[PDB]
Paper text:
Good diffracting crystals of recombinant molinate hydrolase were obtained in two distinct crystal systems, orthorhombic and monoclinic, with 4 and 8 monomers in the asymmetric unit, respectively. The anomalous signal was modest but the top positive peaks in the anomalous difference Fourier map were located in equivalent positions in each monomer and were consistent with metal coordination geometry and with the position of the metal ions in structure-related amidohydrolases. The active site structure was also not perturbed by the depletion of the catalytic metal ion. The water molecules are in turn hydrogen-bound to Lys240, His246 and Asp373.
So far, there is only one described microbial system able to degrade molinate to innocuous compounds: a five strong bacteria consortium from which Gulosibacter molinativorax ON4T is responsible for the initial breakdown of the herbicide by cleaving its thioesther bond, releasing ethanethiol and azepane-1-carboxilate (ACA). This reaction is catalyzed by molinate hydrolase (MolA). Following successful identification and cloning of its encoding gene, recombinant molinate hydrolase was found to be cobalt-dependent, with zinc and manganese also able to confer activity to the enzyme. The structure of molinate hydrolase consists of a homotetramer composed of two symmetry-related dimers with a 67° tilt angle between them.
Author numbering:
A (entry chain A), B (entry chain C), C (entry chain D), D (entry chain B): 30 to 496
Amino acid sequence: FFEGETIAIVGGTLIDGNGGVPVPETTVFIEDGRITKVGSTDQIEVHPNIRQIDAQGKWILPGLVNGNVHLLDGIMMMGRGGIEYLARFEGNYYKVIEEAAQIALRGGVTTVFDTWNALEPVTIARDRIASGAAEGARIFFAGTLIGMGGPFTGDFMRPSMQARTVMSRTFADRMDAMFEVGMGRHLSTLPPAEVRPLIREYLERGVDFCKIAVTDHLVGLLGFRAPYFTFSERVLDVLVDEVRRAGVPLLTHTTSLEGLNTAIERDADLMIHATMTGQAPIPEETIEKLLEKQLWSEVQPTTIAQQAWMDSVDHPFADFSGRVHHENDVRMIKAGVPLVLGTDAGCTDPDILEDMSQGELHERPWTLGEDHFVWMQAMVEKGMDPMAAILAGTANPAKAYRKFDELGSIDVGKLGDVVVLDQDPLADITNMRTLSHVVKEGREIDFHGLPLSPLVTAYPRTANVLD
Amino acid sequence: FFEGETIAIVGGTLIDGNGGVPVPETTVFIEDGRITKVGSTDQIEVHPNIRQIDAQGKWILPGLVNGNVHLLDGIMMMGRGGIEYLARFEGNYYKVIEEAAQIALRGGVTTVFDTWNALEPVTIARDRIASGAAEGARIFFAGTLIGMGGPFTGDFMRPSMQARTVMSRTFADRMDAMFEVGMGRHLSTLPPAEVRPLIREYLERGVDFCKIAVTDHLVGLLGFRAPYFTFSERVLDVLVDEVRRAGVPLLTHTTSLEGLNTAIERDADLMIHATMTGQAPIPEETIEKLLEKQLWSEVQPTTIAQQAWMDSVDHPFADFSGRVHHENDVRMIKAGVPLVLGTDAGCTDPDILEDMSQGELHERPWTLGEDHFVWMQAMVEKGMDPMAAILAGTANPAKAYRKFDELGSIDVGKLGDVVVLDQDPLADITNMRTLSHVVKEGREIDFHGLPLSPLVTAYPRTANVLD
Amino acid sequence: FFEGETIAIVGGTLIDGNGGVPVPETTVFIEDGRITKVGSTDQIEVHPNIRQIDAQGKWILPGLVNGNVHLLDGIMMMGRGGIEYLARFEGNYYKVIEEAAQIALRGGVTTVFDTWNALEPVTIARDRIASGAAEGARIFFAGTLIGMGGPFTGDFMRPSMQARTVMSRTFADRMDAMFEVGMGRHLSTLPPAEVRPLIREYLERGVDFCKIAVTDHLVGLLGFRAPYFTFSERVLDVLVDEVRRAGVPLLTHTTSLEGLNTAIERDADLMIHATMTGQAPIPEETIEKLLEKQLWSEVQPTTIAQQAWMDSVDHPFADFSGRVHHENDVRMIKAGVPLVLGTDAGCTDPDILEDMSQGELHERPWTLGEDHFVWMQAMVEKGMDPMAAILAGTANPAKAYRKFDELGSIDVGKLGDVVVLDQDPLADITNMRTLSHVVKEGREIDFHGLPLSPLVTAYPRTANVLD
Amino acid sequence: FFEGETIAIVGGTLIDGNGGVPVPETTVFIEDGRITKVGSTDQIEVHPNIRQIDAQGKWILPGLVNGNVHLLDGIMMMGRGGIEYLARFEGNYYKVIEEAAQIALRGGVTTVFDTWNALEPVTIARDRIASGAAEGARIFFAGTLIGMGGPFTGDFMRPSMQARTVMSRTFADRMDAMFEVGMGRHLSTLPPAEVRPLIREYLERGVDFCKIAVTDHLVGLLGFRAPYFTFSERVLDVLVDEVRRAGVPLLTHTTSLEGLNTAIERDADLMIHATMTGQAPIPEETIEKLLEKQLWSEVQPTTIAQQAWMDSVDHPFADFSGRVHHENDVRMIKAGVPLVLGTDAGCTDPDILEDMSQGELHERPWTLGEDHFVWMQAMVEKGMDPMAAILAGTANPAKAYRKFDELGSIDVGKLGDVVVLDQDPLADITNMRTLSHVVKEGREIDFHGLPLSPLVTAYPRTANVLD
Ligand SMILES: [Zn+2]
Ligand SMILES: [Zn+2]
Ligand SMILES: [Zn+2]
Ligand SMILES: [Zn+2]
C-alpha cells in the first residue's frame, strides 16, 4: 500500500546531521527507500526518468526526529479534557495515533519516539505505518511508564481536578487498564522477586524501549517541589537488569536532583526532562558526571515569551520549565552536555485548544507538529548553537535510542528520510519552519494534505449528522 | 417508509382505558392506522386475508403512555456520566433519542412525553418517527425547562461533582447551549418586558408543550430542603400568559409546598413531581384545591424495595421519593386526586449501569423501558387501585396533554395503538410486564428486536475497531 | 461606668447634616449627652470650667453613621477564614463585637447598623455599650437575615470552598444555629400559616429592625447572574405584615431587578445593595418609582482603583460592584434618588488580611473603620456631590432607620455625637479622614487608643503563652 | 514542685515485666522515687509511718508504657478538625500536650513516646513534667517526622478534604512551620551534602529520638496501595549516619514491603506500623530477618469489632489495619518477632468525637487513655499470649527506646512506676482495665481526678462567657 521509493534531491546546501560545515551544490540519491549516494551535484548523474526535487537555493536536512511525544495526548490529560477525549474516540484510538503521527510528519518529523501511550493501539498503529498500510511518521514506543498510574489516577489529578468524581468507575477503570497494562502504582507494593517476572513479561510484549518512573508523577497534585522515589534501589535494580537483558534502550523519568543522579548512575540511555529537578539547581558534580559518562539528556524548555505568559497568569505549570529549571537548561547548554530534543507534545483536542488565550497558544511547547520548532528556538534563545540544536533534533535522538545506524543523518546506507527548507536554519533557527518538501524512505509526501482523515482535528463538531 | 396499517385483535378481554368493567370476548378492528370497530368477537366479522392477532385468553389494553421521560438521559447527568455520554454520542444525538424511543416501545409504550431534552435533536427525532422514517414510540416534547441551566451548570452539580472543573469550557458551553437554547438561568435577571419576547420566540420554535421551572433545580447541590422560586410572580405571569397565547399545554416543575400552590393557582395542565415538596407534608387545603380544580399531578414514586435500598446506603436521592414524599404519594392516592404516570426515566449509559449494585438496579425508577411497570407497582403498593394505575399510564397523560381525542384509549376513531398481555393486570399489576404483542397505528411491532441499531446500548465497548 | 456628658465645640465651620450651606464661626454646646445650643461662636457663652474643644480653622460634623456593617465579619465568612475565626473566638463573641464597634468609633462612626450577626452576642454587646458598661459605637441590629442559611451553609460556600468538608459537623451545626436562630433556609419549605408564628416569635426576641432575604444569597456558589426568590409572594406578605405589626423598620436583601422591584412594592424602609441586580441594568421605571415613593436605597460601591485591581486579577467578587452595577450606581446618583451609606464591612482577621496583596487592601470596601471614607470617595468619583455623600453617611441612615429624632444631625435636642475634621470635606471628600476629635453623647473619645483590648486585632499570635 | 517519693505496695501477685511466672504474696518497696526492694511480703518489713498500698488479692505491674502517641492529635488532623482545633488552642499548645499526658496517666501509662508533634510545645511540656512543675506521664519525643509535610500539606489531605482551600494561607503556613521546623517535603529536593547540616542542626535542638519518613505519608490522598520512598538511599544514609552520630534511637515510618526491608537493613531501633505494607503480605525472608537481627517492630492493630465496623461502612482507613495487614499481624505474633505496643493515639477534640457513631467509638484504636487496653485486647484476639502483650506494653518499648535501665519493669534500682489491678490480666486481658492504683516515682496519683485542668476536654462549649 506504501513503500520504499526512488528519488533524487538535487543541487542544495546539505546539512547532513553529522555537524560539519554545510556543503553546497549537493545531491542526495535515494533508491528503494535507502540512501545510495551523497555528493557533488555534478558527480552524481541522474537519469531524467527518475523523480527529482529541485533544491537549488535550498537547504537539505535529514528527516526530523522527535525524542519524546505522546500520540494519545498525555499532557492534556494532566488537566482538563481526558474524559471527553477518551470517550469521544473509544473504538478508534489507533486512528487517533495515526492522525497524530501524520501531524508530526506534516512538520517534517519522519521519526517519533513515543514515551507514554496505551500499548494496544500504539502497537496497532506503528505496525500499520511500518508496513505501509497507513501514513505517518514512523513510530517507536515505550508503551507505559513503569510504575506510573493511568490517566484517572492520582498521577493526573490536581487538587481541584478529579476526573473520577464525575465519570463512571467502569469507564475510568477500563481506561486506566489500557494505559497501565498491569505496570501501574501497585508495582511499588511488591518485593523484588515478584517484580522481576512482571517487568520481563511486559518487555516481551514488544516495546522498542522502556521508560521507568524513577521518581513520582504527582506534580499536578502536589506541585514541583515535593518529589518521591517510586521504587527501592533494589527493585529499581531488578527493573534495570531486565531492560538490559531484553536489550532495548532504557529511559528514565526524573523529577529531582537525586532522581537525576540515580538515573545517571544506572547509565540511562536517555533521561527525560533531566533538568526538571524540584526547582533546585543542578550541582556541578552532576554536570561533570554527564560529561564524563557522555549520557544523553532530553530537556523540555519554554521560550522567553511562553514562560513570560505563564508567569504572568501564575500558571500551575510555570515551574515545569521556568525559574531554576530554565537556569539548569542554560548551564547544561553552556557546559556542552549531550542533548536530545523532546517535548511531551500531543495532538491536542480542538475543544481544549479553543479554550486557550493567545498567550497560551503562542509558542506552546506541547502542540504537536510545531513543538520541535519551538524547542529549537527556545534552546537557541538560551545560547544553544543553531547547528547543535538541529543535531538535537536529528542525529542525537537517533543515537540515544540506538537507531543511528538507520536514521537521523544523511549518509549512504541509511533510510531515505529528508526534508528541504527554503531558508537557512543556521542563519535563523526559526527558518526550520520554511519546509518545502518532505520525503520518507524516498517517497515524497503531500505534507500539506495531512492528516488524511481528520479525526480529533475534525472541526467544528456538528451535533446531528444526517447521513 | 412506515405507516398506518390494518389489523384485528380478536377475542380477548378488553380494558379500554375509560375505567369501566373489562369486557370479555372482544375484538378490536383497526384500519389504516385508526380504530374502526370495537365489539363482541362474534359480531365483528373479519375476512381471513386480514392480519390478525389471537387474543384468546388474553388482555387487550391501549398503547401505553409515559407522561415524563428524557430521551437524552437527564437523571444520569445529575450525577456521573454527563461528559462521557455527551462526548461519545456528539453527532448522533437524534439517533440516541430514537434508540431510547424504541426502548420505550419495547416496553409497550406507544407514546412518550419528553419533558427535558435538547430542542434540535428531539425535533429531528420526533419528525422522523412521526413521518415513518424511523422506528419508535411517538414523541411529544417541551424542549427545555424554562429558567433552568444546562447540564454543565449549577443545576446538575453536586458538592463533590463539578464537571466543569475537568472538561473544556468550549465543550461545556456548546452542550449547555443546545439544551438551554437561550432560556437558561439568565432569564431570572431580566424585567418582564424583556422576558416576553424571549418566551414568545421560544414557543414559536415548535414545541408540543412548555415546562416552566417554577422552583429551582439545585437538589443536587443543596439537597431537597432549601428550595427557591426561579421567577417573580409578575414574570411568571408573563410566561404563563405567553404559553396560553401559544395554545400549548403548560407544565410545571415544583419542589416545594409553595411552589406546588403557585402551580395550582396557575391552573397548570400537568404538574411534574407534584409530591416533591421540600420534605414537608402537603397540607389538606392543597389537596382540596387539586380535587376542586381537578388538575393533573404527575408523581414519581419509589417501590418499597428500591427505597429501602436507598435508605440503607444513605443515598443522596433518598429524599426524592422517600420519607415525607412517600407519605404525600399515599395521601394523594387515598384522596383520589387525578394522577399521571411519569418517571424522569432515560436510557442510561451501560458504563454507568455497570457501576451499580444489585440493589440500585432492582426496581430502579429511572430505567427507561421498565420504569412504567415499576411506577404502577409502586403506586399499587401504596394503595392505588390497579385500574386507576392503568389509567394513569394510558388515558390520564393523554388528557393532561390534550391528546385524548387521538390516543390513550381504545375507542372508535382514535389511533390504533394497542398492547396485548398474557395475564391479568387487574389481578396483579406486575402482570403488566406479560407483553405478547405491541401494535402502533395498526402495525404490529417486532418489539423483541428493538432497538434496531444499538448505539448507547451497544456493549461491550471495544477500544480499537479494525474495519 | 460611661455616660452622657458636657462639652463645647468652639469656633468651627458647621456642617450640620441638614444639607444647607456650612456656617462658619459656630459653636456647639452639649450638656448631659444632649445638644442644647448651636449658634455663632460669640453669642454662645461658655464658662472656662467647662470642657472644650477648639475647632478654630476646622470643620464640625455630626457623629458619622454606617447603615450596614457586620460586627462578626460576614464578608470574610463568604471566603476563607470562617472556621479559624469562629473557633478561635468561641466564648468571646460579644467582645469581638465590642472591639469591632470600637474600631468603627475610631473612624468617627458613633452609630452602626448591623444587618447580619448572631443574635445572642450582638444583643449582649449592644446592651453593654448602650448602658455604658463597654466602649464603642452604639449598635442597632437585625440579628439574622430571614431565610438565609448560616456560615457553614450553601449561602457561604464557593465551588472550591466547602468548609463542612473539613470541620466537625457538631461545630458547624452549633455555629449555624447561633446565626440562623431557627430562621434559616427551612423557612422556604413551609406554608404561610406555619411561617407566621416563627417570624412573630423572632421579632419578639428584641431586634431593632428586620432584614428579609427577598432573593437568594448564593453569589459565592453560583456567581452574580443566576438569582432566585427565597419566598413566594404570599409568604413574603406574611413576613412583611409581621414586621409592620412589630413596628420596626423593614430591610431587604435583593440581588436582581425583580427583587428590587418587589422590595420597592413593599415600601421597604431600607434596601440593601439595591444596585446589585444580576448584572442587568436598572430600568428607568424603577428609578422613577424610587423618586416617586422616596424610598431609601443603600448601595455598596467600589472605587476606581479597587475595581481595577479586582478586574485585573479576575476576582470572583468583581461583579459585586463592577461593570453594570457600577453604571447603576452612576445613574442612581445622577437621578438624585435617596441614598444611604453602607458597606457590609467587618473587622477582618489579621491572618486573612495578611494573605492579601497591596492591590486587594488598597481601598478595600470591607475594612471596618475606613470603609465609610472609601464609600464616600467612591461615590464622589461617580459624580456624587460631596455634601450629598456626607448626608448619605450621617442624616440619611438615621432617617431610613427612623432614628433621625435622636441622631444623624447637629440640632438642638439631639444626641451629642460630633466629629471634628482638620480639613474641608466639601473641597475634597478624602478630607473626611482628617479626624481630630471624636465625641459621643458629649463625651470626648481617646479614639487613637481604640480598641481598648485587642482581641481579633491582637497580633502577632504567639504559639505558647507562658502565664 | 513534684518529687520522687516513698511508698510500699504490699502483698500482691507480682507481674514484673521480665516475663517470668508471676510471684504471689509479693511486696515492692520504693524509696525516693527508686525501687529499693522486691520480695516476699513477710521478708520485707515496712514501718507503719510509711505510705502503703494494700495489694492483697490484686496484681502488681510496672508502670504502663506507650510506644507511639501524639499529644497534639495527629490522627484527627488526617481528616476533619485540624483547623478548628489548632485555631482554638493557639497560645496553649503546651497545656494541650500536658492534658493529653495526664489522660495517658489516667489509664496507668507512666511513660509515653511521642512520635510526631510540634517541637516547641512538646519540649516545653516534657521539661515541665520531667522537672515536676506539671503533672502527667513522662514524655520522650521525636519532634517531627523527617521528610513529612505539616498538617496543611498533602500529607494530611484527602481528595475531598483540603483544608488550605478554606483557611488563611498565613495561618496554614504558621502551623506547618511549627510542625515541620525546616524538615518538611523540601528535603526530598536536596543533594546529600545540603541535607547533612540540616539534619545535624535539627538533632541538636534536643530530641530524644528521631523518626524518618522512609516511605511517604499520602495514604489519605492516594489510599494504602501506592507507596513511595521519600529519599534516595544515599540521602537516607546521610540521615541515618547523623542520627547515629547524635546517639539517639532511630525510628522509621514505613508503609510498604520494600520500606520495611529498607528499615530492617538500617537496623532501626523501632519500626513504626511495621505491618502496614501496602496491603501486600510480608514475605517469610523478612520475618526471618526480624528474628535473626532481633529488631523491634511496633504494630497498630484493630479489634475484630472495630474492624468489622470499619468494613461495614467502607471506611477509608479500613486498610490501615485490616485485610492483609491483619494477617501480617497474625503471622508476626505467631512467629514470635519482637513486638512493641503503640497506637498513634491522641486526645481527640470533643466536637469531633461528638460526630462519631457508637460503632466508630467502640474500641476506637486512637482514643488516648484506653488505646493501650484496646491494643492488648486486639493482639490477644489474634493469638498473642497475654503475658507477651503485657510486655509489649511495658518492657519492650523501654528496650527499643534504650530506657530499660530506668523503666519498663519492676526491678531494684529502676524508677518507682507501678500500677495495681483488681483482676488477673493473665486470665483475661481486658482485666488490664481494672486499675485500682497508679504510682509514678513512688508517688501515688489521684488518677480519677485527671486531667487537672480540662482544656480540649472541657465540654460543652459556651458561646459567650460572662466573667
Ligand atoms: Zn514525565
Ligand atoms: Zn423536574
Ligand atoms: Zn446582602
Ligand atoms: Zn506513620
